[PDB]
Amino acid sequence: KTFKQRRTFEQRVEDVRLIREQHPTKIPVIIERYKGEKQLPVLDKTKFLVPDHVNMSELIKIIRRRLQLNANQAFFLLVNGHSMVSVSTPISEVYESEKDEDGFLYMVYASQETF
Ligand SMILES: CC(C)(C)c1cc(O)ccc1O
Ligand SMILES: [Cl-]
């Protein structure tokens, strides 16, 4: 079901090394629905190339636009398992501190704060 499940550490590592070569200005982000989630829909895809200059505030807006939400639907974004300390931080900086050993940046979303 989940991304880590579907691809070997070996495969995930090699895809990250390719995105480096072919999309050097992009952050490799895995974005996944919380396995509990009742309200929000699933995304068309799992793996996104996010421009390295957008802050987390713009990445939340992007994904809310991808899910086509409206003003009073709720959306929470976890990064590498925990809450974001700050939405104002650039995704280049967030990558360097929050990346996985495979080289992706893992994110999970829900309508509840209690995942
Ligand atoms: C081919 C390319 C490196 C651009 C790529 C894009 C993507 O969304 C997922 C995997 C990839 O290797
Ligand atoms: Cl690029």
First to last CA, the chain: 18
CA distance 21 to 45: 21
Phi (first) and psi of residue 108, to 5 degrees: -140, 140
Provide the greatest CA pair distance for the chain: 41
**Residue 26: exposed, middle, or buried by beta-carbon count in 10 A (0-12, 13-18, 19+)?**
middle
Given strand 82-83, what is the order of strands in its sheet?
47-51, 26-33, 105-110, 76-79, 82-83
Q: Rounded to the nearest whole angstrom, what is the distance from the C-alpha of residue 47 to the centroid of ligand 1?
A: 8
Experimental method: X-ray
Ligand 1 atom nearest the C-alpha of 19 is 3
The enclosing H or E element of 26 equals strand 26-33
Q: Enumerate the β-bridge partners of residue 12.
A: none
The enclosing H or E element of 109 equals strand 105-110
* Cα dihedral 7, 8, 9, 14 sign: negative
CA distance 115 to 105: 18
* Binding site membership of 19 for ligand 1 (Cβ less than 6 Å): yes
**Residue 54: exposed, middle, or buried by beta-carbon count in 10 A (0-12, 13-18, 19+)?**
middle
Measured in angstroms, the resolution is: 2.2
